[PDB]
Amino acid sequence: SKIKKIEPYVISHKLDDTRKICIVKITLDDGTYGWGEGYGPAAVIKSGIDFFTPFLLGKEAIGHEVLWQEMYRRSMDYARSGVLQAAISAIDVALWDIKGKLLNLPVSVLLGGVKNPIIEPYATGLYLEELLVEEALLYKSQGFKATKMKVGLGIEQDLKYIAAIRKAIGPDMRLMIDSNHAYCYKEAIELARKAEKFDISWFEEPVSPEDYDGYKRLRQNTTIPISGGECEYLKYGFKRLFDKDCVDIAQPDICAAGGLTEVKKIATLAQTYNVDLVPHTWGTWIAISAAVHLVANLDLPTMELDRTENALRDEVTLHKIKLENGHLEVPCTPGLGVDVDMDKLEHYLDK
Amino acid sequence: SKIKKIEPYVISHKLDDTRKICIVKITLDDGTYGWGEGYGPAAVIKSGIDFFTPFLLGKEAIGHEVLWQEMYRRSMDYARSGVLQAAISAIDVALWDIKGKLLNLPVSVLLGGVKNPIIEPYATGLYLEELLVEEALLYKSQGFKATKMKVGLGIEQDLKYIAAIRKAIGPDMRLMIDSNHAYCYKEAIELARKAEKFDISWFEEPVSPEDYDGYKRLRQNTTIPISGGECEYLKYGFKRLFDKDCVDIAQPDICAAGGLTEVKKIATLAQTYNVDLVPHTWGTWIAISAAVHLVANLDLPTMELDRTENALRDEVTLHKIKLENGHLEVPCTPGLGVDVDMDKLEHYLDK
Amino acid sequence: SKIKKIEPYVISHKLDDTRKICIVKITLDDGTYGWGEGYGPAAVIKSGIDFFTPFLLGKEAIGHEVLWQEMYRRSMDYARSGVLQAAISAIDVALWDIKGKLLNLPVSVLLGGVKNPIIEPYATGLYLEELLVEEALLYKSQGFKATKMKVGLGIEQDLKYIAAIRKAIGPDMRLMIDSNHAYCYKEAIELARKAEKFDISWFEEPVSPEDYDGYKRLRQNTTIPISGGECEYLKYGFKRLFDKDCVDIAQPDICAAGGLTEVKKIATLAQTYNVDLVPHTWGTWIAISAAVHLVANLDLPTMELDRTENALRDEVTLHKIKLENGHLEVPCTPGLGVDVDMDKLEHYLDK
Amino acid sequence: SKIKKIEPYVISHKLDDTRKICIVKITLDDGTYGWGEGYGPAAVIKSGIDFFTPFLLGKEAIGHEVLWQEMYRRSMDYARSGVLQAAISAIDVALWDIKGKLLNLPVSVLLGGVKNPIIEPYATGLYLEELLVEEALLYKSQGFKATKMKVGLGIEQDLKYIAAIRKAIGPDMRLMIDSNHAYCYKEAIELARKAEKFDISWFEEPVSPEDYDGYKRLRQNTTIPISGGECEYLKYGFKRLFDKDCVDIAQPDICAAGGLTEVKKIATLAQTYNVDLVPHTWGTWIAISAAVHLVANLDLPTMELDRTENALRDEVTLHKIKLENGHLEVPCTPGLGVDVDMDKLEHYLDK
Ligand SMILES: [Mg+2]
Ligand SMILES: [Mg+2]
Ligand SMILES: [Mg+2]
Structure with a gap:
């Protein structure tokens, strides 16, 4: 004990x-x-x-x-x-x-209860050029209902690529853009206003996590919902962010913000402030599991599913969770429902 | 180079x-x-x-x-x-x-110019009981014009000790109290109101660095100036502290807040907001030197001079700076004006 | 010395x-x-x-x-x-x-470091009528990537000229409009809303530098970024401008606002408030040099390059800086990298 | 004409x-x-x-x-x-x-009308030590109902002198203190709280004219009315001072803020904001005359009557105005009611 x-x-x-x-x-x-x-x-x-x-x-x-x-x-x-x-x-x-x-008991039931037994996650796929269209078409074929693309290659370069991916996926599949604070307020609305025509589900980290007034203004000047909070830590940080009416969607990373205990407290706050929560997840299946269990307990939802190459996720970590035709199913197994292959752990460790 | x-x-x-x-x-x-x-x-x-x-x-x-x-x-x-x-x-x-x-050239001159060639630092002395009075009397005898005492042993216990130290040092020597966020708003004003009679120069970190509304309220309900910012990082962090009218004195630590480059930028901000700056210093002479050179360039000033039992500061680091009868003299030597005894470095290292 | x-x-x-x-x-x-x-x-x-x-x-x-x-x-x-x-x-x-x-050392390195070794400045060209088109075409031919035109000849007169210059320069070259506070809020949005279609990079000094609420409203009602601060002095003045969310771009003149020392302090503030800084420059190469060194230390950037008839700039002052095909190159020479021809100085003077 | x-x-x-x-x-x-x-x-x-x-x-x-x-x-x-x-x-x-x-017609009648035909000005007397007491006793003997003393020699030094002057003048004569922005917020309330017992009519320029938040806080923490605006220029400057609830008394100098035309416009604003106006006057009788005519038109009042050694005020400028037993009488003569002795003008001129 x-x-x-x-x-x-x-x-x-x-x-x-x-x-x-x-x-x-x-x-x-x-x-x-x-x-x-x-x-x-x-x-x-x-x-x-x-x-x-x-x-x-x-x-x-x-x-x-x-x-x-x-x-x-x-x-x-x-x-x-x-x-x-x-x-x-x-x-x-x-x-x-x-x-x-x-x-x-699983973590979701232990957080208060499984509110969503099924989740539909989005496929993340960061960057010649025509290869991006193929990666997207793979995700649509893989059943995915939504996909998140990385932007920051230049306002006119992005608008050329966003147009290409939307043409491939058609109108039925959801599409989101992620700057990674690679733009400023003037550069962000220029992209936002121009990319609106391509039905963007949201704009992730459009400006500096420090530019709160920039986030608020961008939200006021564009139709595309504003995401942010990757870089936001603790209940105190997210309170400070929500007091500024910055985001439409708060994205705390369980592995960064303060774990399951704090992301749950941030979830209470999000609720009180009537702001959506889609957590940020970019690690192994241990990381993904904590999000599976958090969005299940949250009140079809989505979550970040890294489709990028990564043998620390696929090989080192063992998940029980099932994904078929864009839908993920919350596990009933005690705990997160994850293990680590200790041979692949030793093989991939660092010196 | x-x-x-x-x-x-x-x-x-x-x-x-x-x-x-x-x-x-x-x-x-x-x-x-x-x-x-x-x-x-x-x-x-x-x-x-x-x-x-x-x-x-x-x-x-x-x-x-x-x-x-x-x-x-x-x-x-x-x-x-x-x-x-x-x-x-x-x-x-x-x-x-x-x-x-x-x-x-020295760092001060390289930051813009020596504004104060002489500084008068304060002696810090944290915690039977009658030993505190002796440590204080030693500092007054050593020429010190001010001394900072640690509080958080209980409202009635502190008021008992603050009374004792003030009785020993007399009325001419300045005295400051440091909670170390060991108190809540109700506990802080209880101490503040009660300790007002013993002429307190300032109250350092009275509540949680997260309790901005608490700082502001405390400032409104007590005559004792409110210090804070030990736990504040970057220009962005100090801008939010100042925007909420929290402190009378901002205390960034050079070695924590972003170095000499950022504490200088924080100094520009403090200036614009018309808030005093006394940096936080609690390390070796590498740290003390950076503060010597910063308060020299700031516009008699004071700084944090740790007087506790510290062989790591006194043995591993070699300073050139001179202190006689409470007054410290800014060095003219190139750089910070510090070196490391490489034998005491090897001796004191960690495994 | x-x-x-x-x-x-x-x-x-x-x-x-x-x-x-x-x-x-x-x-x-x-x-x-x-x-x-x-x-x-x-x-x-x-x-x-x-x-x-x-x-x-x-x-x-x-x-x-x-x-x-x-x-x-x-x-x-x-x-x-x-x-x-x-x-x-x-x-x-x-x-x-x-x-x-x-x-x-050059000034930029002495301000903290060369962040941008190459700058791309804009050509200024104030005011029959068809002569303006020729002046613009000259700048395009001279490799310039952007040009700033003077407006204030009347809402319908300006929209007639802005259309003409945009037709000549094509879509690839950037174009900015400067009122010189010759317009009021109602007159400014009338021009802003009508001139949008011509892809305006920014609107310089649209209303009175005293009309802060006018600046904020204009920013809210137009897509064209709002520039201002020519007439703003000191860190205290720019704090007051930024507190009211007036401008997208702050334009302090080094030679007016408080020199390199204060425009640097204004640069720290602009940074904290997450507002861009493009300085105002309208003098000799002594003035241009100070901006070259400031935008170099600022974190491809642009600066004001007066391309009008001026012999006090081109004859009295001697620059070392190199400009070929729209790009300028920051000098490595000690100081600003400027001198004054004392014979031309004596020639152009005042009784 | x-x-x-x-x-x-x-x-x-x-x-x-x-x-x-x-x-x-x-x-x-x-x-x-x-x-x-x-x-x-x-x-x-x-x-x-x-x-x-x-x-x-x-x-x-x-x-x-x-x-x-x-x-x-x-x-x-x-x-x-x-x-x-x-x-x-x-x-x-x-x-x-x-x-x-x-x-x-006189200026007061031409500003709208003589509201106060008699005004009672205050005697200004800046700084061994016992000489200040004599200068004050002279003013009380000369009929003056109020006197303004200069402070900034140190909190304990001032409180020592304020006590001395109050002892000499007794309780019947009004007394005001002027820092000349020689104090910071912490230094200002220290002086304010301690000097309260000596019945101070007002505290002139207590902190930096840039420290608006300091003025407001000082007003909240002391009973002594707060004066300021010496360093404030135009209607726009005074609107910003009043918007921040800084002063109890606004002190524009006619000869600095924008003349009689603007101090009258500032008077309209002061009125709307329900803040008293006592102008700042520190020149020759050309300057004093403008204040005589302004406080006459303002709605027994006081004004700044410089009683120091001034040969340019008493020799170069010729006044018609009459002062007997603390009371000044507004002149009926056309214009300000002043002339310049052209011989004393030629004598005192600069090269
Ligand atoms: Mg992201
Ligand atoms: Mg401390
Ligand atoms: Mg201009």
């Missing part, structure tokens, strides 16, 4: 640069382990976990909030945003896998 | 628990070195420096802002506050020691 | 009225000189310099901020805006030429 | 440094002259008048607002505050002396 060993692992591989992820395993005196993930710079997150590890060993895993508050009280002064929050999120997601196992 | 090797060093020391601070040495192709420091969890900052090190090598040190913006562009999605900011701060302070050396 | 002699010179020439500009030369004990410029009424600025000259002689030029603060402390009650600010600006730009020379 | 010659004169005199003030004489084709004054740096104001002089010659003096608007249209881009406003003020006050003479 008590924590015996927290074990952070930095997993990597280069494809065509490198993908460096930090992954934890918290195991109890009884052998009951739990899998969690942190989002950001792998090796920095890994040291973060090491920082909290002394104050978590021999303490009870069911009262996960008592541990979250200990980690918070310890890092408050040196955290707020960034790295130590990804360290707290990584431990949290594992304590929710433990609890799920421990109380023999 | 390109960067050839960035070298982060975690140095440990237990007295009566442990004091673990991270430090950097950036050395150019020409063997010009510069010393820097990060504030927060040593081993986490140390990995942070390692994160930016690949994109800093083979780049010119004089154009320090080009490097700051590269580090920012790289961490803007996974930082905003905490750990990666103290990694950016640490590199910055060392690039200012390099520039100082390189152009054969 | 210390300041031995500040020398203001009012220079003029009538072409087809007169252009009366004031310039300064600050000369050190060691004969190190620095060239500066003030923007506004020459003879009034010239007396301004004379006002500060007594309190600047025998003082050190490297600690330029110590001098800026002396000039400020002296003229704060009788300044805030206008004439004495252009007096402080003129001295500042020359102390930055001195420092550049003194420390053997 | 057109303007034939505008003549600015810079008059200098050293006592125990120099007092350099600029004065104007506008004379019509018919030999009707009018005397004016500008407040600030004499030689800078003198060049300002020279700037507008070309666009004022051969134009009618009764339609003074047509001239004010011409000067404004010309200066707005390079003025807003300071020097060019004091040039516009100087011309304005002389056009009001002309109009007064021209229509054979």
Whole structure:
């Protein structure tokens, strides 16, 4: 019932640069382990976990909030945003896998209840040129009901590509654009106003996460819904964002914002402020699982399903979840419903 | 004058628990070195420096802002506050020691000019009971014009001790109280109203750095000036602190908030908002030096002079600065005016 | 070295009225000189310099901020805006030429670092009628990527001319309109809404610099980005402009707003408020140089390149900077990289 | 009746440094002259008048607002505050002396009507130590009902002197304190709270004219009424001061803010905002006269009566006004009721 060993692992591989992820395993005196993930710079997150590890060993895993508050009280002064929050999120997601196992229930049921047993996720596909059209047509064939494309190659370059992908997918499939704060307010509305004709479901991270007044103005000047919050941490950060009427959709990453415990608190806030929540997910199947269980408990929904090459997701992590013809099905298995192939873990670790 | 090797060093020391601070040495192709420091969890900052090190090598040190913006562009999605900011701060302070050396001028002169050639710092002395009175009497005897005491032992316990220290130091010496966000709004005004009679120069971090409305209310309900910002990072963070009329004095830590480059930008903002700036300093002389040079360029001033038991500061780092009868004299030496005893560095290092 | 002699010179020439500009030369004990410029009424600025000259002689030029603060402390009650600010600006730009020379580095590197080694400036061309089309076609042929035209001849007269210039330059070249506060809110949106179809990059000084609510409303009712701040002085003035969400682009004139020192502080503020900065430039190459070095340090960019008939700029001032096919290249020479032909200086002057 | 010659004169005199003030004489084709004054740096104001002089010659003096608007249209881009406003003020006050003479009526009657035929001004007396007490006792003996003292020598030094002057003058005479923005918010309330016991009628310029939030806060934390606006220029400047609920009393200087025309417009605004107006006066009798006529038309009042050593005020300018036992009597003579001794003018002139 008590924590015996927290074990952070930095997993990597280069494809065509490198993908460096930090992954934890918290195991109890009884052998009951739990899998969690942190989002950001792998090796920095890994040291973060090491920082909290002394104050978590021999303490009870069911009262996960008592541990979250200990980690918070310890890092408050040196955290707020960034790295130590990804360290707290990584431990949290594992304590929710433990609890799920421990109380023999999935995480969604343990968060309050499965509100959506089926989810329809969107396919993410970032960038010659005609290859993007093929990647999109693959997703439509793969049953997907929506797809998220990466923009930031230039206002006139993007509008040329957005036109091409919309022509391929037709009008029935949903399409979203993601800048990655690669544009400024003037550059964002120029793209927004011009891309409106292609029925864009939303615009993800259009300006700097620091440009709150820019987000609000963009929302006022375009019909396309405004997404943001990848870079937003804790209940306090998202309150600050919602008080500014910035986004139509809040996108906290479970692995970054403060884990399942805090993204649930952010979900309460989103609700009160009457703002939609679609979490951000860009890691292994441990990361994806936490989102599966969160959107199930959220009140057909969508979630981020990275279709990009990644053997740290497909090979290192083992999911029980089922996806056929754009629809994903929430698992009933205790905890997140994930494991790590310890041979593929050792093969893909870092030096 | 390109960067050839960035070298982060975690140095440990237990007295009566442990004091673990991270430090950097950036050395150019020409063997010009510069010393820097990060504030927060040593081993986490140390990995942070390692994160930016690949994109800093083979780049010119004089154009320090080009490097700051590269580090920012790289961490803007996974930082905003905490750990990666103290990694950016640490590199910055060392690039200012390099520039100082390189152009054969002190940092203050290189920040714009020595406005205050003499500064009068305050003595910090945290916690049987009668020992606190002796530590204070020592500081008054040592020439100090002001002293900062730590509070959070209970409203009635603090008021008992604040009365004792004021009785010892008399009326001529300034005295400040520091909660360390160990109090809530109701607990803070209870102490503030009760401690008003013992002439308190300021109340440092009275409530949570997240409780902006609490700071503002406390400022409205007490005569004692309100200090805060230890836990505030970047120009964007201090703009939101100032927009909410929270503090009378803003206290950014150079080694945490974004280095000398950003604390200077925070100084421009503080100026525009007509709010005083006294930086936070709690490290080695690499950290103290950066503050010496910053308050010199700021427009008799004070700064944080840690007077606690610290061999890591007093032994590993070598300062040139002179202090006699409460007054500190800004050095004219190129750069920060600091060096590291490489034998005491090897002796005090962490495994 | 210390300041031995500040020398203001009012220079003029009538072409087809007169252009009366004031310039300064600050000369050190060691004969190190620095060239500066003030923007506004020459003879009034010239007396301004004379006002500060007594309190600047025998003082050190490297600690330029110590001098800026002396000039400020002296003229704060009788300044805030206008004439004495252009007096402080003129001295500042020359102390930055001195420092550049003194420390053997260009101004941009000395402001923090060259962020943009290449800039693409815009051609200014103010006003029968068919002559304007030829002036524009000349700029397009001269490789310019953008051109700024003067408007204020009447809503229907301007829309007639804007149509003509856009027809000549085609769709690939950028085009901006400048009212010179010659329009009121009702007259401004009438032009804005009608001129949109001609792809206008921005609208410069659309209403009175005093009509902040007019600027905000115009921004809300038109797609064309709103420029302004020519007439704005100091960090306090620009804070006041940004607090009211007036402009998309802030245009401080280095030679008017408070020199390189203050336009840099305005640049920190613009950054915090997430508003673009394109400085205003309308003088000699002393003025153009200061902007070259400022936009280089700012984070392809543009700047104001006056392409009208002016011999005080082309004959009295000597530049090192290179311009070939719309692109300008930041110089590496110590200081601004400018000199004054003292024979042409004596030739163009005032009794 | 057109303007034939505008003549600015810079008059200098050293006592125990120099007092350099600029004065104007506008004379019509018919030999009707009018005397004016500008407040600030004499030689800078003198060049300002020279700037507008070309666009004022051969134009009618009764339609003074047509001239004010011409000067404004010309200066707005390079003025807003300071020097060019004091040039516009100087011309304005002389056009009001002309109009007064021209229509054979005093200025107060020509501003709308004498509301107060008798006004009780205050004696200004800035700074061994015991000499201040004697200067105050002289004023009480001279009949004065109120006196304004200069503060900024240090919080404990001022409280020592304020106590001394109050002891001498007794309880019946009013007493006001003037910082001259020599204090910051923390330093201002320290002085305000401590000086409350000495019945202070008002606190003039307590913080920087730029620290609007400081003024507002000080007003909230002290019982002593807050004065300010010396450094405020135009109707636009005073609207922004009043919008922020800064002052209890607005103090525009006629010779600086925009002359009698603008201080009257500022008076309309002050009225609408329900804020008192006591103008700032620190020049010759040309300046004092303009205030006599303005407070007469304002709706027993007070005004600034400089009682220091001033040979330019008492020798160069000739007044008709009468003062006996603290009460001043508004003159009925056409215009301001002032002349200049042309021999003492030629004597005190500058090179
Ligand atoms: Mg995204
Ligand atoms: Mg502290
Ligand atoms: Mg313009």
